[PDB]
Amino acid sequence: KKEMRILMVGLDAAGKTTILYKLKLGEIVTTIPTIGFNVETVEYKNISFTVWDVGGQDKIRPLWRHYFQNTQGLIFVVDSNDRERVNEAREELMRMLAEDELRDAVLLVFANKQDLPNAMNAAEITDKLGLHSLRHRNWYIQATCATSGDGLYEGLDWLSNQLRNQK
Amino acid sequence: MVLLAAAVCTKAGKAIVSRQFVEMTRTRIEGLLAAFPKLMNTGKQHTFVETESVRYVYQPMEKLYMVLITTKNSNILEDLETLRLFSRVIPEYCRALEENEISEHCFDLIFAFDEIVALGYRENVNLAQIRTFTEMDSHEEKVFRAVRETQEREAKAEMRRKAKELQQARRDAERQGKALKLGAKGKEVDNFVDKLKSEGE
Amino acid sequence: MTAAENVCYTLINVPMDSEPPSEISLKNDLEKGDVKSKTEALKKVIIMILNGEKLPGLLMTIIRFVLPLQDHTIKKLLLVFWEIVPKTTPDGRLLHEMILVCDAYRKDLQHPNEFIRGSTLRFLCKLKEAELLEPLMPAIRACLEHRHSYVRRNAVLAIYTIYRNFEHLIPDAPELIHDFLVNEKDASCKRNAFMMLIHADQDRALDYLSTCIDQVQTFGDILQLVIVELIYKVCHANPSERARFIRCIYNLLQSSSPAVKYEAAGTLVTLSSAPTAIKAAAQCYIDLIIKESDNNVKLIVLDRLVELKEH
């Protein structure tokens, strides 16, 4: 099985840990904001994805740099209901994408919490994050509900196909 | 009434392992352990040494000494029972009472010593309880692991099922385009109290 | 603080016979080794740090590759590693990396293995960093209600040390431990709860003792010794209380435990100067010297008779 290292990052309360355990255990884990990281191995289509869920709190964001090394795919989780912090999520994403160690990393953006009535749609998040300005980077945005699991498998299927063609 | 430290020393006076149960500086405990071999009197029929500040209580173990460092006001009866318990713990981990085996098993000894004494007070433990506590064999952990392995198996089965469905959906999308009573209990205590009252207390 | 002025709970004087493992070798064994190689590498790292070597480059390697392991030996060795590793910068600030370690302590306090919980609680008694203890307080409190006496007895000691060093983290600790002591059945848990109350709140310890004073003779020797220690401290601070406890201490002179007899005789001399009380204590010492076969006991109890004679 091809082993792939994936870094999952984003702001606090974006639902990163809920996505990770929904993929691994099939269940919704009610998570307090992650004050650390989780590492879990998820198997999809004979690829073993080692996913690193790093906490998104302001105190933890400076530590994301330590996880960039040997990252083949980047999953950026955004709370699509949090309109106030979308600009902060854009700045942090752009700061990460400027790092040379992430230059060859494939970007998957999860527009999470699409089940909420005030959630920004995937197109509005694409514009607010400025994803169309990214040159020479393969990116995809998927609308996701971490609680139902909707869109999570479509995002992984895209990631698996991209990482299979990169060799 | 406080056990300060427990140490295993060579007959040459080298401390191999020491565990402290109270807040001591490294310089203080190393000083106390370095003084011990010079303070040891040979040819005496007792196994303690007192300084101005501390008491050493020790037991010879072939080429080694098991040493307890206590306060001068520590209860010697409790300290001797504690010393006997420490001396019985060493052979449970070390087959030979030599410096090399004590050095190889130093962490197992530290873990066993922490089961005997907490904050300078002796725990009510026997050798079999120390063994049980150091083995860490938990029934709850075994049950928790068995439940978690079962959940991981189910999640793996579901993930394989969804992976097949997605791969099939892609292929289909590509295809479609009255006796006299003598003696009352407690009379001795009452007589003692009545004597003390007669003495003005 | 220099390593020599720091609190030292462990001394290991192993002759480093073999070439001292390079930091790069240790790092490779910790990252890529099997559980046995990781265990031996971690033992070597602990011994090197105890002998005054500074290995700051290994901290994150241990956090990433050793901390998530579920091996019981590695879990215990990690508690010894966290006891000795510098947690603060030279300027006294907590290292940023320690936040990742704090979540591991919280997981270990919730671990299904009761011995991991108990060992982690015992380690927390040695922690001096309030910022690491604050997020653990809910998990430490939950360990008081644990089904195993091994967890409960160590949870009482953890609460006692946290209250003593950082009262603001658990200001209700004396009340919480009093309610624990009243409901507890395990003798070791009762002793540890009572010992905390002697140091933190003597009035609550006295209130508990007042409910059980007539039953003290039926208690285990460990609980009797801690009760004698309370009676000594209270009667030393407040001489008016002596009249209340003389009868209890005299009953403890008849204990089956020679350790309790010795401590009760020593305490009786401090409670009463009356000739009858001194005679009872002196006879108890003479009887201990005659009955006890150990020359260490004979000599030390003889010194108590010599101290009595100096008055």
Which amino acid is residue B122, in one-letter code?
R
State the helix-helix crossing angle for C187-200 and C221-237, rounded to 10 degrees: 10
User: Which has the closest alpha carbon to C152: C186, C197, C175?
Assistant: C186
Resolution in units of Å: 7.5
Residue numbers of C between 17 and 36 with CB closer than 8 Å to B? none
Pairwise CB contact (< 8 Å): B199 & C275: yes
| Count of other CB atoms within 10 angstroms of residue A87 | 11
Domain count, chain A: 1
Experimental method: cryo-EM
A129 known member of a binding site: no
DSSP output for C133-155: HGGGHHHHHHHTT-SSHHHHHHH
Between CA C266 and CA C283 the distance in angstroms is 12
- Using a 10 angstrom Cβ sphere, with 0-12 exposed, 13-18 middle and 19 or more buried, the burial of residue C22 is exposed
The answer to whether A59 faces chain C, any CB pair under 8 Å, is: yes
CB burial string B33-64: b at 16+ within 10 A, e below: beebbeebeeeeeebbbeeeebbbbbbebeeb
Between CA A69 and CA A58 the distance in angstroms is 21
**Host H or E run for residue A112:** strand A106-112
Contacts B110 to C, Cβ<8 Å: 10, 80
Nearest to C99 among A36, A39, A66 (CB): A36
Between CA C162 and CA C168 the distance in angstroms is 9
Nearest to B151 among A25, A44, A45 (CB): A25
Phi, psi of B37 (to 5 degrees): -65, -25
Assign 3-class secondary structure to A128-152: HHCHHHCCCCCEEEEECECCCCECH
C154: Cβ–Cβ under 8 A, 6 or more apart, which residues?
B118, C117, C118, C119, C121, C122, C143
Pairwise CB contact (< 8 Å): A26 & B163: no
Q: Coil, helix or strand for C228?
A: helix
State the helix-helix crossing angle for C114-124 and B127-135, rounded to 10 degrees: 100
- Using a 10 angstrom Cβ sphere, with 0-12 exposed, 13-18 middle and 19 or more buried, the burial of residue B151 is middle
- CATH code of the domain covering residue A162: 3.40.50.300
Up-side HSE of residue C5: CA atoms within 13 Å toward CB? 2
Q: Which of A57, A69, A72, A166 is catalytic?
A: A57
Q: Which two tokens stand for residue B108?
A: 């197992």
Helices assigned H by DSSP within C85-148:
98-109, 114-124, 130-133, 137-143
Pairwise CB contact (< 8 Å): A24 & B166: no
The answer to whether C267 faces chain B, any CB pair under 8 Å, is: no
DSSP output for C44-67: HHHHHHHTT---GGGHHHHHHHTT
> How do beta strands A139-143 and A106-112 pair?
parallel
Q: Coil, helix or strand for B61?
A: strand
Between CA C256 and CA A7 the distance in angstroms is 66
> How do beta strands A106-112 and A73-79 pair?
parallel
Nearest to A35 among C60, C96, C103 (CB): C103
User: Which has the closest alpha carbon to C49: C22, C76, C12, C91?
Assistant: C12
The answer to whether C222 faces chain B, any CB pair under 8 Å, is: yes
Can you give the residue range of the structural domain that contains A112? Answer: 1-166
Up-side HSE of residue A145: CA atoms within 13 Å toward CB? 9
Among chain C residues, the shortest Cα distance to A57 is held by C99
Q: Scanning the structure block, which residue is given the tokens 């980077």?
A: A137
Chain A adjacent subunits, 3+ CB pairs under 8 A: B, C
A1 known member of a binding site: no
Pairwise CB contact (< 8 Å): A60 & C135: no
Q: Scanning the structure block, which residue is given the tokens 């040159």?
A: A135
The answer to whether A65 faces chain C, any CB pair under 8 Å, is: no
Q: Coil, helix or strand for A89?
A: helix
Among chain A residues, the shortest Cα distance to C98 is held by A36
Helices assigned H by DSSP within chain C:
23-32, 35-50, 59-65, 72-84, 98-109, 114-124, 130-133, 137-143, 149-165, 173-183, 187-200, 202-212, 221-237, 242-252, 258-271, 275-291, 295-309
In angstroms, what separates the C-alpha of C126 from chain B's closest C-alpha?
9
**Taking every pair of C-alpha atoms in chain B, what is the biggest distance, in angstroms?**
114
**Strand-pair partners of C7:** B25
In angstroms, what separates the C-alpha of C132 from chain A's closest C-alpha?
13
The answer to whether B169 faces chain A, any CB pair under 8 Å, is: no
Up-side HSE of residue C98: CA atoms within 13 Å toward CB? 20
The answer to whether B147 faces chain C, any CB pair under 8 Å, is: no
User: Which has the closest alpha carbon to B197: C250, C275, C264, C245?
Assistant: C275
CA A131 vs CA A76, C97, C310: distances in Å? 12, 32, 91
> How do beta strands A2-10 and A47-54 pair?
parallel
Q: How far is C-alpha C15 from the geometric centre of its chain's CA atoms?
A: 30
The residue of B196, B198, B199 whose CB has the most chain C CBs within 10 angstroms, and thus the best one to mutate to test that interface, is: B196
What percent of chain A is helix, strand and coil (3-state, nearest 5)? 35, 30, 40
Between CA C308 and CA A147 the distance in angstroms is 77
The residue of A20, A24, A40, A142 whose CB has the most chain B CBs within 10 angstroms, and thus the best one to mutate to test that interface, is: A24
Q: Which two tokens stand for residue A13?
A: 């309360």
A122 known member of a binding site: no
User: Which has the closest alpha carbon to C109: C123, C92, C129?
Assistant: C123
End-to-end CA distance of chain B: 29
In angstroms, what separates the C-alpha of B166 from chain C's closest C-alpha?
33
Q: Coil, helix or strand for C115?
A: helix
B133: Cβ–Cβ under 8 A, 6 or more apart, which residues?
B115, B125, C115, C118, C150
In angstroms, what separates the C-alpha of B139 from chain A's closest C-alpha?
24
Between CA C80 and CA C75 the distance in angstroms is 9
Contacts C276 to B, Cβ<8 Å: 192, 195-196, 198-199
Q: Which two tokens stand for residue A20?
A: 């990770």
Are C155 and C181 in contact by the 8 Å Cβ rule? The answer is no
Q: Scanning the structure block, which residue is given the tokens 């060992």?
A: C119
> How do beta strands C10-12 and B15-20 pair?
antiparallel
The answer to whether A58 faces chain C, any CB pair under 8 Å, is: no
Between CA C119 and CA C154 the distance in angstroms is 8
User: Which has the closest alpha carbon to C52: C21, C12, C95?
Assistant: C12
A16 known member of a binding site: yes
Q: Confirm whether A57 is a catalytic residue.
A: yes
CA C213 vs CA C227, C248, C270: distances in Å? 10, 7, 19
